[PDB]
Design a binder for this molecule. Structure first.
Ligand SMILES: COc1nc(N2C[C@H]3C(=O)N(C)C(=N)N[C@@]3(c3c(F)cccc3F)C2)nc(C)c1F
Length: 387
């Protein structure tokens, strides 16, 4: 329905992540926490770091409980180490509940905290299977549902500004909404279409067809989900498996061939700039991802614009961007630049993810993002990768 208390509770941007205010401990210690559907731990800075202006101080919390266990998390882009415990946790612009949750108190880290991101921890919203050190460490959302009457569902509306936000603007700007326990109808237009959650670990989905400006990429659909496809608010880009990325970039280059861009742009490294207001959106194609539907032999599609996959960056008065589609060796990742086009419903109760056009997606007068269906699609189970 309507969840006014939770609307506009996020801040941030696709490159540095979107965060929500939370409190930990007694008396409550306020922290900004990145919303991450690509991990399953609640982990917060708990020791001084040059990029943190605040951190969780366990000795100041009367409700802190030490689990006497460490946790070491090395990942591709960095690492963090911490100490496990539990404490009382709340979300001020959330459900009016307080729960006892696991917290990994980060004591050491490398390339984890981002200078100027304004967040001090991460809220892993995925399933226990991928929790660290193992699946016995109950994730925050599982604790929230078990201890309260909050429905087993959350929904995210990530709002890209469509232009760069400076240090002050990004702190003053509304970055979107995280609706805990429901769907807020003011955040989207049109209908919600649902895709099954293939397996409960990451939020895994199955892509069954890909188009660039209506032209079928025509790959065996198993390539689109090799080795998995996931929805991850903690990744900035739309990441595609190597072979799919190579085919998609060739097609995007062909569609936009009236302007030549350097190799560094297509590698997502180099910015491209245009005179203020002259970004040639129309030369860039729309991209449609067809997802398995809930009905047998039915799919639907989500369509994004270059206003989603070209990420605004500061250079001058020029309008500059980076190409926010990049290669992956770990499957498709529908990151924040894709989520910015849609209101995304993580319906854990019904093992499905819903998509609708976002009320805050960036577009122009000629094209809009879309969520459309149904389409007849056969043998969609064959699109899923095994082993
Ligand atoms: C919190 O706890 C854990 N965290 C991670 N993560 C992996 C990271 C990552 O690469 N992506 C793509 C990702 N989705 N999540 C990470 C992340 C961010 F989102 C944003 C900024 C920094 C980050 F480290 C955090 N993984 C495991 C296993 C955790 F226990």
């Amino acid at each position: 329905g309507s969840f006014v208390e939770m609307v506009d509770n996020l801040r941030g941007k696709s490159g540095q992540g979107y965060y929500v205010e939370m409190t930990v401990g007694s008396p409550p210690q306020t922290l900004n926490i990145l919303v991450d559907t690509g991990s399953s731990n609640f982990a917060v800075g708990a020791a001084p770091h040059p990029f943190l202006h605040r951190y969780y101080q366990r000795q100041l919390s009367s409700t802190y409980r030490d689990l006497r266990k460490g946790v070491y998390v090395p990942y591709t882009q960095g690492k963090w180490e911490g100490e496990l415990g539990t404490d009382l946790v709340s979300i001020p612009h959330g459900p009016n509940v307080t729960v006892r949750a696991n917290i990994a108190a980060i004591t050491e880290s490398d390339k984890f905290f981002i200078n100027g991101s304004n967040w001090e921890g991460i809220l892993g919203l995925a399933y226990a299977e991928i929790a660290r050190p193992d699946d016995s460490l109950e994730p925050f959302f599982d604790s929230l549902v078990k201890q309260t009457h909050v429905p087993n569902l959350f929904s995210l509306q990530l709002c890209g500004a469509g232009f760069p936000l400076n240090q002050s603007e990004v702190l003053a700007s509304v970055g979107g909404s995280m609706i805990i326990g429901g769907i807020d109808h003011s955040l989207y237009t049109g209908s919600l279409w649902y895709t099954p959650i293939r397996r409960e670990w990451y939020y895994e989905v199955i892509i069954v067809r890909v188009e660039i400006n209506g032209q079928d990429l025509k790959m065996d659909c198993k390539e689109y989900n090799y080795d998995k496809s996931i929805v991850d608010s903690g990744t900035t880009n739309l990441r595609l498996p190597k072979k799919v990325f190579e085919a998609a970039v060739k097609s995007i280059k062909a569609a936009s061939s009236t302007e030549k861009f350097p190799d560094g742009f297509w590698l997502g490294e180099q910015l491209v700039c245009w005179q203020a207001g002259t970004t040639p959106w129309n030369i860039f194609p729309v991209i449609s991802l067809y997802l398995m539907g809930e009905v047998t032999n039915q799919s639907f599609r989500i369509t994004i614009l270059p206003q989603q996959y070209l990420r605004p960056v500061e250079d001058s008065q020029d309008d500059c961007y980076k190409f926010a589609i990049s290669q992956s060796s770990t499957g498709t990742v529908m990151g924040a630049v894709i989520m910015e086009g849609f209101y995304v419903v993580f319906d854990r109760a019904r093992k499905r993810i819903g998509f609708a056009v976002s009320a805050c997606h960036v577009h122009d007068e000629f094209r809009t993002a879309a969520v459309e269906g149904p389409f007849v699609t056969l043998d969609m189970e064959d699109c899923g990768y095994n082993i």
